[PDB]
């Protein structure tokens, strides 16, 4: 076999501006989550009661999602972008953060979300939201970090939310907010649909910061509940 | 023009692509000709044929095309295709019309930055920015077997038939519909669909040659 | 892969440069039951244009105020005085009197917005607190008759909501490009428009401000 390498050939065209690198790194670890409930008022068949997204946090099969998504589920289904579908067990949940942890049991290696514990999110950072709006299939939307928390009391009622204008819709809750490197910045929350005044908000969404999310996950895995 | 290239900008894509995107008006008799609906169109190649969506020009008594340079021409229908929702128009202008950049070698990738170019609410040509959000989508309607690019570049009534382009100004798609199905009153945000350019060019060529898509 | 040494794409430089000079503006209404609390009649934003404490906002934000309150991102809160307003351009100028230095918005008088330029909108949507949203310049005025009825609006798809009016639209260098105003929120067909917002170009806004400061009003 010839010991010398052959030239590698590459595109002859200019490179389009793109966040595909972040997508390739992060999106395989973001799953579609389905809450199925027995329809008691029919023949007890399972049906999708609500849906959202989730993030595979480690190779063992632990997944973070939102508690409201999986509340009162008779069966929780997790679908990966490679086509695999699993039934998940509920490990635990925390109402104070609206986070829940699921566990799946898989034979083949699981993709995991990139996490850089030393990365500090900054206002103005470009972010991608990854989730399953309206069950159309995994969708990537792009925005920036609009705020990283609040000092004063405010309409979210919270002080540590990330805020973003990456389009968030029903189905995105529990999914990932990542930066342009594919690093997890947060877990997207429920969508903000209507203002107190009755206006339709545009480009206003919230996420639980990743540092808090991982801390809560670890507690739920270890103890099955958050003791404070 | 002495254009200042300093700020972060997609003006390069705009200057290359936007002159080739036209405003399309579907006018019907009343007493007189009123606008029934409107959209956009893309001047595709040196031949000067314009692509738009069939739903934009359907049942039109008169089709008007307005170029960004201020000229206004009646357009004549070359052909259309219901399955792909595409139509091709010709205008009676002399040649040399600005054309959209097209790169047949380019594969749209999820995450690519894109600009939507069209005429939302008859405001005049409008550029909005997003990314390719997904590929191979059946669209707003759950039943179909067509393939769409999905984008979060904001599109509104009046964008249909318009261009979706990348940072190079290359045509990625023809914007076609916005997802608007609500669960319980909320408004879907940032979910729009476009016909991939590769399909649009294949259908255009068939309509130019045969006047219809022969299947 | 290992992304530790990689740098996230960011417009934080523009935010750090411009955001401190963008204030929350509150139009307070006392009514009968809110004499001793802040009941908000109207919500908006404003831009500190110079160290003296002159602030640009929109006239509709401050119309009919019993009191005008301005809050800075550094936590300072001031009573603001109405210096003047211009109905034609829907601009108003406020004045605050502060002991400590004030942040001012970056201005590059030679820079002009171009279609496709990346922009950040900075304001106080829904009283959430200062919020940065990102879009591009969608249009720079219109030559002919159009649905805004005006010819000089910047149009942008940076998300704008109630509370943003009077705030800043800045480019990637943090330079002021315009003053955000009301967005297109409901079409005649009953649809909800997305990504259609308008701003007054900064050159026009600065001219109006200068006149209002000098005369208390635009003299024709």
């Amino acid at each position: 076999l010839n010991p010398l390498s052959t030239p590698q050939f590459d595109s002859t065209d200019e490179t389009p501006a793109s966040y595909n690198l972040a997508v390739r790194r992060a999106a395989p670890a973001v799953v579609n989550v389905y809450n199925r409930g027995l329809n008691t008022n029919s023949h007890n068949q399972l049906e999708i009661r609500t849906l959202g997204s989730g993030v595979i946090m480690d190779q063992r099969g632990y997944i973070i999602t939102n508690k409201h998504v999986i509340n009162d589920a008779d069966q929780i289904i997790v679908a990966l972008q490679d086509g695999r579908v699993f039934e998940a067990l509920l490990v635990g949940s925390d109402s104070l953060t609206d986070l829940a942890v699921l566990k799946i049991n898989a034979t083949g290696g699981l993709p995991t979300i990139p996490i850089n514990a030393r990365r500090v999110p900054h206002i103005g950072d470009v972010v991608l939201a990854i989730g399953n709006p309206y069950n159309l299939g995994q969708t990537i939307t792009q925005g920036i970090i609009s705020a990283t928390g609040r000092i004063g009391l405010n309409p979210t009622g919270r002080q540590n939310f990330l805020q973003t204008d990456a389009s968030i819709n029903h189905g995105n809750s529990g999914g990932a907010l990542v930066n342009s490197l594919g690093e997890l910045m947060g877990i997207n929350t429920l969508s903000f649909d209507k203002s107190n005044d009755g206006e339709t908000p545009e480009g206003i969404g919230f996420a639980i910061p990743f540092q808090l999310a991982t801390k809560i996950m670890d507690k739920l895995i270890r103890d099955g509940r958050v003791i404070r």
Side-chain angles (χ1 to χ4, degrees), chain A residues 54-115:
Chain A
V55 184
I56 302 172
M57 298 293 291
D58 70 59
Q59 53 182 357
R60 297 175 300 177
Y62 289 102
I63 296 170
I64 288 179
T65 187
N66 276 157
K67 181 175 181 299
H68 63 261
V69 176
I70 55 77
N71 271 348
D72 306 324
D74 290 301
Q75 178 189 47
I76 302 167
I77 294 178
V78 163
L80 279 64
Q81 303 319 315
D82 68 4
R84 288 185 284 173
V85 182
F86 299 98
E87 175 166 337
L89 290 183
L90 178 57
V91 173
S93 70
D94 173 37
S95 53
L96 294 192
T97 61
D98 196 13
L99 290 167
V101 172
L102 310 177
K103 174 67 161 65
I104 57 172
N105 295 337
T107 63
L110 292 171
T112 55
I113 196 74
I115 297 176

Side-chain angles (χ1 to χ4, degrees), chain A residues 122-154:
Chain A
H122 292 116
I123 301 170
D125 282 357
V126 173
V127 287
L128 305 179
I130 306 175
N132 190 24
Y134 296 108
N135 202 20
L136 294 165
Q138 187 178 76
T139 292
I140 316 296
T141 51
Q142 174 270 316
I144 58 163
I145 298 181
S146 302
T148 50
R150 302 299 182 173
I151 292 295
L153 296 178
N154 66 90

